[PDB]
Design a protein around this ligand. Sequence first.
Ligand SMILES: NC(=O)c1cccc(NC(=O)CCC(=O)N2CCN(c3ccc(F)cc3)CC2)c1
Length: 180
Amino acid sequence: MKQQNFCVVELLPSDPEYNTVASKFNQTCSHFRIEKIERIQNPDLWNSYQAKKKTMDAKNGQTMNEKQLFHGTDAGSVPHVNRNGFNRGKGTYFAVNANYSANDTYSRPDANGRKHVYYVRVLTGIYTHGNHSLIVPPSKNPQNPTDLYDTVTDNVHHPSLFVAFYDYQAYPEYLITFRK
Ligand SMILES: NC(=O)c1cccc(NC(=O)CCC(=O)N2CCN(c3ccc(F)cc3)CC2)c1
């Protein structure tokens, strides 16, 4: 099997890519001081994500299957997330707004008070409303319960949080390190 090797490239604050990630982060987290933004380059996890992205784009027609959402995680979970993504209830949570993921429950501050939030490329595809109780995605058609939804959101009209259940559904593209 593919070992899923990766590289972590630190973006300069003068780099246009840093300003774009900073721009989305500061839409809800302007009160947080960004210590650094690093781009995770995992070719195997990327190709695998882009494989599922190809299949989804051909399934969901006109739908924009991809959203860029936030994920707050502990310091210690960063090398695991760099190499594996959010693969392995079965679900991984993703916030539309960065201040949701900036909660110390999710982005637990380390010994130096640094908090970590990934600016993830997720394959939200075709989604419906989900409660806190479900562990598997619901069936689109009950007469064909094999065809399941790609994600589940809190509000279908105004999404704030998403639940990804599938392998290679998310790519941890950016790591935002920040403090209070
Ligand atoms: N780790 C994160 O950054 C992050 C990003 C978005 C959401 C979350 N985590 C949570 O919301 C966890 C808390 C929690 O357990 N809830 C709040 C909302 N929940 C929910 C579950 C499924 C839905 F369709 C809609 C909402 C499940 C019960 C974490």
